[PDB]
Design a binder for this molecule. Structure first.
Ligand code: MG
Ligand code: MG
Ligand code: MG
Ligand code: MG
Lengths: 244, 250, 242, 243, 241, 198, 233, 111, 244
């Protein structure tokens, strides 16, 4: 019957590893790099659109930076289509929570729930893992600005700065080297772009090749704010940081 | 009996490749060239009606399909996969949207729905992925004119213009040369026809070519009048004759 | 990679024969049945000096007149006991009487061959056989004191004495010589403690071996350390004697 | 493992071998068939071959009545053909009940083709090794030929032919329609269009037929029927007094 | 729908998936647990491949199951969450239907039960997790410490470690743990714990974490400086002879 | 019905709950505590149909206890009642609804403000200075309308309650066997054990 | 060949054989012998019971299905439990619903149909047991031989299990004698112990070893073990 | 409106002696004012020396008698031909009966 | 690279389904069985290999009746054909319940046809190891059919299958030439006994038992009945006399 054709996606290797998760993680390594850096007064998300044309509509596009609710956003590396499946259910879990508690979902709870879905595909059902890694950038009034990563395995961790996708080794050492805890947000913007400049496989790093977003807080307001950068604004911020 | 295949038939190979998605894209590569170009006041989708016999009637098989009165589709790849993707796309436009909000979905959202339908053939138990790439052209009040590509992976991106299938690499080069953000609709039709001549071997006229636009409303395809806020569909598939007019003065 | 309930050309089930292998690797367990009670003895076999050797439960109560010993993959036994205890308690509820030992055993063994899909049978949800054999000892009014050997093969045998586990083939040949129909309870308690001492790798103290019995009068009792301690003391003396 | 050749998944070159092999099975009967459109009718001709003398020749047919109006001929093994015929009759009945008007030829074809496309994608189903030619005089489209295959493909034909010698007949008709310049046969009575088909089947294949070598189905306004040997015998007599 | 039998016997009588599960634990970061006379202390090591970490938010290894019982683990972090969540749920359910919080052995028997089932149910793979469960039965002062492994097996321990280089730390403990007289202080029990990790960590200034459980739901975790004071007084003492 | 009263003063929330358990013709107990502590700083009282009353209260209790352990965090009172309201709103359209009216009194640690929530069995929630369920309201509300000041102390609030309980012991046809009073403030939950003779 | 076509019962060999079924039939041969024979008034089952150690029980091989019908097993004992349990139900169903004792011929048809279902579906396995079914219904004495393949045959006498070929030849020779033992139970059993003796390299058939069951005319199905079979050894 | 229950009259008596027992009943089955049968026994032998009557609604009576008789049969099959003692039988019946607690067997029953 | 014959629903490169072809083998290996359609009824005969004196004569019945008017005989795996007739009985009752009229033989044939074909559609089942000869008298004539493991069935003047299949078809073809007139109910019973006797030449080393059944508008009222006693012995003798 069927047994012949089963890849058995949820089995251990003799080394105690999960083939599918590892090859999924291998897949992600080829995907464009995403970086998140958390400062005292906000968070930065930067990502590299992998492969472009001059005919690609830059404005009406989204492939790496997605909004989950008003306080939580994600950087994506891997299969875009898989990510949207997970992103939608995440957007929903955030809303179920609001309906139940009349408060916005705390970032960790969102991250755990999503990662628990991922761990599922790892352990039963015999389907392939989601070929997706996530940087989560969020704010809640318990832990302030938070940064999280999750991958196909179902594991999430918290960070001061992190990167997913291609060249994370190169990127992770560069961040570890220039990151100071009491960074202001405009320092963190600058560092994120530098690191991406230094890891790219392209000629250089133009605006059409970037997605960029910040979670801030207009100092004379007392409430959080998400800003996804329009293609023009990324070109502005590329000039000031000194890579024209 | 019963689908005893409840496990994925698309898995990750050691190198990180998804085998079945790669091979699906290969089938698209052999498909007859289709293309789409976006103007400032309209969009155009075109393809070649490659006839498998001169005994077949090529009208009885549309490669260009209306999805909503404001959204059209075209493809490269396996016809049959496209046909059932068109029926599902039409249906989801009602079930997931029209029956909820009393209006048709905007272009991105419907696209996104098709993308979801394909993504699932890439993960669900006991299926291969869809062997087509879709070009979807639409208009909606709040986003204006748009053109989207959907790959067997379930991945979609917006385009100013692009082509898929056979001579797509040549055509994408051809299109980069001729595109600008000041194009009127008539001009993009003209460019579309030219780009498609490169890929067309045999006869090239309004019988061997299928071409559709997303223009302004045709108050005359509506079928009724009296409701002044219904001007009718923006999708119009051009006639065998209408195509030839633009060729006799090509 | 064939099915799970494939037959070998010899005419035996693959997964059921391999489970029997898993059992041989298990702790030694010995049961001896007299006309004064049934005795159950196990090897604890702590994998380290740091392990608290009495948190090892290889002898369990099923009812006040039925207890069992296990050998093999011992986590697999948890659900077999749960079902057994339930079968007994249930049977009491329906009938205001103690369940027969042969009936309790039959009930446990029914569970054992249920490893399928529901296709061409009924419903058989469970992926692999149990990795554990059981010695089921008890009393009832119809057949008095009884000792049963329960396998993952579905079959179960009645025994006057039986040993399962790593020492199983050597310990058995020993029981063959010692066992006679007139054995007293104390004589059986010593015999269990003797044969365990032999096949165990370790030096048998009241910590890496456990004793129990079921008599009609006092039911099924586990022997605590002090009482087991004094029965080893007595074996040393009686073996040095001749 | 070369298992990409056993179920309906993609080969590295992007093909589905099981689909391709299912086409092979269609020719396994070694029956040739063709379809042509009259002025207001549609006719299908099939080779009737009865190899065994022990067979009841009246039960040996590859032409099926789907509805009052739809007829279907099958190139391919009989068990898959009857499997396909039954679905079609069930699909056609239910269309009428739900929608209150006779299932149109082309729509039935689209449905059957949609069922085929499914066996192409869902792994547990094998394709049906048959090619299905549908005929009727549609109340809206006029006389109609619509054909589907294991690929999930379907199109409308001016005329078509199928079987091991698909090509001889196809080219024969390809020629005729160029000299005649019209995309049908300009003839009022169906009896004459039935003859025309039998004639170009002889001339393409290069063989003569007796009333027991052919099988004929005719579609008219509101009815589809098959000819008996005697109704064909009349046809074979008619052709032979002129050519 | 999917029920393929993944955990099966091989001819040598072995269930390869459960043994490979153990291999995953073997590569998990080391966890240790030792018990005193009036406390149980749980230690874990932290990895230092990447350490630009936000330790405020990152999941810690020692998890509360009820207010009187904790659970640390070694192996796949994702799988651990599926046990911790189930065990927390079962703790509340027990309080609800029995009107008393779980005994430490019960909470353990329950987790083990779950782990076992995943080794003989179709379509599911075993948990690549081993656990140490520590705490005090309600209204009791006699300390408890248990260990479970993927096979569904469990038992109590005077002290035990699991994960990578656990042979080394168990070795240390088999030498340095006296059952005649266990650690009598909170302090002298925490010291014995830090010592055993130092055989594996190599500077645990911020790569060692410690949690102290006491009778009556009295559980607190130490911070770097508090642990730093132990690392300091251990290596200075070990220096001279 | 049972008496369920609540008053939000300034530093805290005060909950009074009748002690009687009447089944049919007999009073079966005169020392009944119609309350559950949901978390260290959140208290719920309840009155209604026989079995439902406790079974629901205990259920909600376990669910908040689970949430606290999962998040090592105590939800705000505002969030607890929102959860409770949803449970009841779900319950009303089920095959057999929980017939339970509750009061939720809590001290919010973020805002440092006490809060009193009244929810009936239908899922009708409102935040109030003072609330009551059943007939209690008809007597006590008017008396509290008069004597309530938002800046009352725990002491003054207890005086104001003593006045409500007296009015009910006077005009209520039923002997509800006195009350059990509990205070919810920044230092947790305590019980004023001396309300029989105070 | 062989190797490739024996992974499950859903597969035919190129010869046209079902290897999983034939390996099931091999469990029978590997199993302890049992014999069946009928006259016109009675039907007997005789069985050699097999033990593991010399300290173990002799595992029982005869099961009662109803008051007028029973069977003997050779092969996988848990499977004979599954099938007799099913057969009990069918006997029971007939009494309750139609107030009719189930025809022995029909019990065969029922078992066949149940066994057959296992030989055509994926993830199933054939029954690994042979069965001999005796009964006295409304048309006299009956003996059935059941194979895991689904083949149920009505015979006068037969044997299955290890070395059963010796007993089978004996009965083929004694046919005309035993068919006429009408009205004497004791003599028909004597001829059933004599028949089972042609299948012994082992040893003397003792008190704990032997198992005999009888049904017919004026006797409900009953089983004998112990001193019950003393007068027959 | 269909009423699932009827009444067939009859009366039964059971007296436990010091080493014996009797269970008696009339042979009369009746509907309303008509007689149905003058001989219709409703006291039954169930083997294992247990006699039983389920008097009241005759359809539910036969159903219970039949179900318990079958319990006896299946007790032998499941427990190596053990005798079902009177106390055991009683408990068994309590379960047969309470099993239909929400659509009762309309019978006063005596064994 | 091959392996085309391991799963049931797989097409080989030349278009064949090998499992069905292997099924046929088990049929050809089986006992021989035949059917003869006369001018008002149908005759069904089968060979019964007596392995031993122990088999009870007259007892092990192979021919099955479906409804009251249909007879079935099959060669090959006996338990399969039993199962197929079980499905045939369900199908016949269901049809009668809805339509009142007892099921027509063509109607009935397709019911088996559709069900048998449906066992060549998925790898999760195997094909039927039987060829089935069946028929009876309906509202317009007698009908004779034969059904292959493939699902294929046709109407026959005469049909044969099993070990003696080739010699039978030869005898059958003779009859079709001598009597293009008809051939009565009473004659075909004798002629079937002959054709079974001649086809026993192949299974010659083992002794056999003949079994005949018929369904005739004039001789059985259009109902299926077994040939017994005097008429059976008269046809056995006709076969013996004409074997020399
Ligand atoms: Mg043929
Ligand atoms: Mg398929
Ligand atoms: Mg398949
Ligand atoms: Mg009793």
């Amino acid at each position: 019957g069927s047994r012949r054709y089963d890849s058995r996606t949820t089995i251990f290797s003799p080394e105690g590893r999960l083939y599918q998760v590892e090859y999924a993680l291998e897949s992600i390594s080829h995907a464009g790099t995403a970086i998140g850096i958390m400062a005292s007064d906000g968070i930065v998300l930067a990502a590299e659109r992998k492969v472009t044309s001059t005919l690609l509509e830059q404005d009406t596009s989204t492939e790496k930076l997605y909004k989950l609710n008003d306080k939580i956003a994600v950087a994506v590396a891997g299969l875009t289509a898989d990510a949207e499946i997970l992103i939608n259910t995440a957007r929903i879990h955030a809303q179920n929570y609001l309906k139940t508690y009349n408060e916005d979902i705390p970032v960790e709870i969102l991250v755990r729930r999503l990662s628990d879905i991922k761990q599922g595909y790892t352990q039963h059902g015999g389907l392939r893992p989601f070929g997706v890694s996530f940087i989560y950038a969020g704010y809640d009034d318990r832990y302030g600005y938070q940064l999280y990563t999750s991958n196909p395995s179902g594991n999430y961790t918290g960070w001061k700065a992190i990167s997913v996708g291609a060249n994370t080794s190169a990127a992770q050492t560069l961040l570890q080297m220039d990151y100071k805890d009491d960074m202001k947000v405009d320092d963190a913007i600058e560092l994120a772009l530098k690191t991406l400049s230094k890891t790219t496989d392209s000629s250089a790093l133009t605006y059409d090749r970037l997605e960029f977003a910040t979670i801030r807080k207009g100092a004379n307001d007392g409430e959080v704010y998400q800003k996804i950068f329009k293609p023009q604004e990324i070109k502005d911020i590329l000039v000031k940081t000194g890579i024209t | 009996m019963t689908d005893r295949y409840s496990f994925s038939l698309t898995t990750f190979s050691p190198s990180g490749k998804l085998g079945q998605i790669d091979y699906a894209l290969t089938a698209v590569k052999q498909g007859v060239t289709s293309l789409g170009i976006k103007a400032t006041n309209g969009v155009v989708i075109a393809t070649e009606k490659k006839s498998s016999s001169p005994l077949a009637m090529s009208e009885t098989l549309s490669k260009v399909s209306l999805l909503t009165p404001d959204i059209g589709a075209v493809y490269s790849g396996m016809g049959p996969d496209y046909r059932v993707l068109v029926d599902k796309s039409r249906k989801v436009a009602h079930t997931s949207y029209k029956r909820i909000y009393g209006e048709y979905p905007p272009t991105k959202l419907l696209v996104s729905e098709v993308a979801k339908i394909m993504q699932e053939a890439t993960q669900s138990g006991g299926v291969r992925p869809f062997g087509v790439s879709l070009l979807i052209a639409g208009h909606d009040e709040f986003n204006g004119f748009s053109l989207y590509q959907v790959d067997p992976s379930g991945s979609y991106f917006p385009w100013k213009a692009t082509a898929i299938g056979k001579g797509s690499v040549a055509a994408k080069t051809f299109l980069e040369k001729r595109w600008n953000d000041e194009l009127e609709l008539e001009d993009a039709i003209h460019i579309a026809l030219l780009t498609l001549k490169e890929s067309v071997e045999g006869e090239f006229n309004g019988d061997t070519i299928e071409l559709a636009i997303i223009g302004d409303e045709n108050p005359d395809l509506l079928g009724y009048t009296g409701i002044p806020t219904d001007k009718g569909p923006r999708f119009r598939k051009l006639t065998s004759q209408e195509i030839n007019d633009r060729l006799e003065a090509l | 990679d064939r099915g799970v309930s494939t037959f070998s050309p010899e005419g035996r089930l693959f997964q059921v024969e391999y489970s029997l292998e898993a059992i041989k690797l298990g702790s030694t367990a010995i049961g001896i049945a007299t006309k004064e009670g049934v005795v159950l003895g196990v090897e604890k076999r702590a994998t380290s000096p740091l392990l608290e050797s009495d948190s090892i439960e290889k002898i369990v109560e099923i009812d006040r007149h039925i207890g069992c010993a296990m050998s093999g993959l011992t986590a697999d036994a948890r659900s077999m006991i749960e079902h057994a205890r339930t079968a007994a308690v249930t049977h009491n509820l329906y009938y205001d009487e103690d369940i027969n030992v042969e009936s309790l055993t039959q009930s446990v063994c029914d569970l054992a061959l249920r490893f399928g899909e529901g296709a061409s049978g009924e419903e058989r949800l469970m992926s692999r056989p149990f990795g554990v054999a059981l010695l089921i000892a008890g009393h009832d009014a119809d057949d008095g004191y009884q000792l049963f050997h329960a396998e993952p093969s579905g079959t179960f045998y009645r025994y006057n004495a039986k040993a399962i586990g790593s020492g199983s083939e050597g310990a058995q040949a020993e029981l063959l010589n010692e066992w006679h129909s007139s054995l007293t309870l104390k004589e059986a308690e010593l015999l269990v403690l003797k044969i365990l001492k032999q096949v165990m790798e370790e030096k048998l103290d009241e910590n890496n071996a456990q004793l129990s019995c079921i008599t009609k009068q006092d039911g099924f009792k586990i022997y605590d350390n002090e009482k087991t301690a004094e029965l080893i003391k007595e074996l040393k003396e009686k073996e040095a004697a001749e | 493992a070369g298992y990409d050749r056993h179920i309906t998944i993609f080969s590295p070159e992007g093909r589905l071998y099981q689909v391709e092999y299912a086409f092979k099975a269609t020719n396994q009967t070694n029956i040739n068939s063709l379809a042509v459109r009259g002025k207001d009718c549609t006719v299908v001709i099939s080779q009737k071959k009865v190899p065994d003398k022990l067979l009841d020749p009246t039960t040996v047919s590859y032409i099926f009545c789907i509805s009052r109006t739809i007829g279907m001929v099958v190139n391919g093994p009989i068990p898959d053909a009857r499997n396909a015929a039954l679905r079609a009759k069930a699909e056609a009945a239910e269309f009428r009940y739900k929608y209150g008007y006779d299932m149109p030829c082309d729509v039935l074809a689209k449905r059957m083709a949609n069922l085929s496309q499914i066996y192409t994608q869902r792994a547990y189903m094998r394709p049906l090794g048959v090619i299905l030619t549908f005929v009727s005089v549609d109340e809206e489209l006029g006389p109609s030929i619509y054909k589907t295959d294991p690929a999930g493909y379907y199109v409308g034909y001016k005329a078509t032919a199928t079987g091991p010698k698909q090509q001889e007949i196809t080219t024969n008709l390809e020629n005729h329609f160029k000299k005649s310049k019209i995309d049908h046969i300009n003839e009022e009575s169906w009896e004459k269009v039935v003859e025309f088909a039998i004639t170009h089947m002889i001339d393409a294949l290069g063989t003569e037929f007796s009333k027991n070598d052919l099988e004929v189905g005719v579609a008219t306004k509101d009815k589809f029927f098959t000819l008996s040997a005697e109704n064909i015998e009349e046809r074979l007599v008619a052709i032979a007094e002129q050519d | 729908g999917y029920d393929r039998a993944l955990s099966i016997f091989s001819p040598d009588g072995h269930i390869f998936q459960v043994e490979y599960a153990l291999e995953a634990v073997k590569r998990g970061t080391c966890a240790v647990g030792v018990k005193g006379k009036n406390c149980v202390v749980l230690g874990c090591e932290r990895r230092s491949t990447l350490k630009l970490q936000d330790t405020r938010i990152t999941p810690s290894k020692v998890s509360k199951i009820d207010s009187h019982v904790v659970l640390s683990f070694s192996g796949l972090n994702a799988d651990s969450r599926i046990l911790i969540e189930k065990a927390r749920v079962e703790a509340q359910s027990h309080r609800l239907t029995l009107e008393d919080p779980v005994t430490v052995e019960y909470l353990t028997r329950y987790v083990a039960g779950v782990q076992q089932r995943y080794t003989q149910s179709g379509g599911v793979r075993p948990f690549g997790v081993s656990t140490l469960i520590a705490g005090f039965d309600p209204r009791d002062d006699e300390p408890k410490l248990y260990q479970t492994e993927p096979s569904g097996i469990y038992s109590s321990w005077s002290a035990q470690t699991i994960g990578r280089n656990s042979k080394t730390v168990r070795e240390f403990l088999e030498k340095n743990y006296d059952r005649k007289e266990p650690p009598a202080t909170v302090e002298e029990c925490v010291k014995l714990t830090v010592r055993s990790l130092l055989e594996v960590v190599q500077t645990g200034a911020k790569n060692i974490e410690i949690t102290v459980v006491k009778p009556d739901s009295d559980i607190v975790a130490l911070s770097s400086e508090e642990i730093n004071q132990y690392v300091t007084q251990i290596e200075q003492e070990k220096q001279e002879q | 019905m049972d008496i369920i009263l609540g008053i939000r003063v300034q530093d805290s929330v005060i909950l009074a709950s009748s002690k009687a358990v009447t089944r049919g013709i007999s009073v079966l107990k005169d020392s009944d505590d119609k309350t559950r502590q949901l978390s260290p700083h959140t208290l719920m009282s309840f009155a209604g149909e026989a079995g439902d009353t406790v079974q629901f209260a205990e259920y909600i209790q376990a669910n908040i206890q689970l949430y606290s352990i999962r998040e090592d965090y105590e939800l705000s009172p505002q969030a607890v009642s929102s959860f409770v309201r949803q449970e009841l709103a779900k319950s009303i359209r089920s095959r057999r609804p929980y017939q339970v009216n509750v009061l939720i009194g809590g001290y919010d640690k973020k805002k440092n403000k006490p809060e009193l929530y009244q929810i009936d069995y239908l899922g009708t929630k409102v935040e109030l200075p003072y609330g009551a369920h059943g007939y209690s309201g008809f007597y006590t509300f008017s008396l509290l309308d008069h004597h309530y000041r938002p800046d009352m102390t725990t002491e003054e609030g207890l005086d104001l309650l003593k006045l409500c309980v007296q009015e009910l012991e006077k005009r209520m046809p039923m002997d509800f066997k006195g009350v059990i009073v509990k205070i919810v403030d920044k230092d947790g939950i305590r019980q004023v054990d001396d309300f029989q003779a105070q | 060949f062989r190797n490739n076509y024996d992974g499950d019962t859903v597969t035919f060999s190129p010869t046209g054989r079902l290897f999983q079924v034939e390996y099931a039939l091999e469990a029978i041969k590997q199993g302890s012998v049992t014999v069946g024979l009928r006259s016109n008034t009675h039907a007997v089952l005789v069985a050699l019971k097999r033990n593991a150690d010399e300290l173990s029980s002799y595992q029982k091989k005869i099961i009662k299905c109803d008051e007028h019908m029973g069977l003997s097993l050779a092969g996988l004992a848990p499977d004979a439990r599954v099938l007799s349990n099913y057969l009990r139900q069918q006997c029971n169903y007939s009494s309750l619903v139609f107030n009719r004792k189930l025809a022995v011929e029909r019990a065969g048809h029922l078992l066949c149909d149940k066994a057959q279902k296992n030989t055509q579906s994926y993830g199933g396995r054939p029954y690994g047991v042979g069965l001999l079914i005796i009964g006295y219904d409304k048309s006299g004495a009956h003996l059935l031989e059941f194979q895991p393949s689904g083949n149920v045959t009505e015979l006068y006498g037969t044997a299955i299990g290890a070395r059963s070929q010796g007993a089978k030849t004996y009965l083929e020779r004694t046919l005309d004698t035993f068919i006429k033992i009408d009205g004497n139970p004791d003599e028909l059993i004597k001829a059933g112990v004599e028949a089972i003796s042609q299948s012994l390299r082992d040893e003397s058939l003792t008190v704990d070893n032997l198992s005999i069951a009888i049904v017919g005319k004026d006797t409900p199905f009953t089983i004998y073990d112990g001193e019950a079979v003393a007068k027959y050894i | 409106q269909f009423n699932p229950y009827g009444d067939n009259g009859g009366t039964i008596l059971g007296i436990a002696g010091e080493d014996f027992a009797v269970l008696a009943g009339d042979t009369r089955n009746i509907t309303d004012y008509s007689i149905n049968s003058r001989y219709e026994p409703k006291v039954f032998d169930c083997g294992d020396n247990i006699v039983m009557s389920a008097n009241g609604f005759a359809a539910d009576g036969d159903a219970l008698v039949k179900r318990f008789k079958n319990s006896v049969k299946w007790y032998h099959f499941d427990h190596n031909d053990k005798k079902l003692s009177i106390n055991s039988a009683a408990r068994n019946i309590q379960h047969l009966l309470y099993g239909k607690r929400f659509f009762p067997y309309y019978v006063h029953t005596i064994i | 690279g091959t392996g085309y014959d391991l799963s049931n629903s797989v097409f080989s490169p030349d278009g064949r389904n090998f499992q069905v072809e292997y099924a046929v083998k088990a049929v050809e290996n089986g006992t021989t069985s035949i059917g003869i359609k006369c001018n008002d009824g149908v005759v069904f005969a089968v060979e019964k290999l007596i392995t031993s004196k122990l088999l009870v004569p007259q007892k092990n019945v192979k021919i099955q009746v479906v409804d009251r008017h249909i007879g079935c005989v099959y060669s090959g795996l006996i338990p399969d054909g039993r199962h197929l007739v079980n499905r045939g009985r369900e199908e016949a009752a269901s049809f009668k319940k809805l339509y009142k009229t007892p099921i027509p033989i063509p109607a009935f044939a397709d019911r088996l046809g559709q069900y048998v074909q449906a066992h060549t559609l998925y790898n999760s089942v195997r094909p039927f190891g039987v060829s089935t000869i069946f028929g009876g008298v309906d509202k317009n004539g007698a009908h004779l059919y034969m059904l292959e493991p493939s699902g294929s069935y046709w109407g026959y003047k005469g049909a044969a299958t099993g070990k003696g299949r080739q010699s039978a078809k030869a005898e059958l073809e003779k009859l079709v030439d001598h009597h293009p007139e008809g051939l009565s109910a009473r004659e075909a019973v004798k002629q079937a006994a002959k054709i079974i006797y001649l086809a026993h030449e192949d299974n010659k080393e083992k002794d056999f038992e003949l079994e005949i059944s018929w369904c005739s508008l004039s001789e059985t009222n259009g109902l299926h009945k077994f040939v017994k006693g005097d008429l059976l012995q008269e046809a056995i003798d006709f076969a013996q006399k004409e074997i020399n």
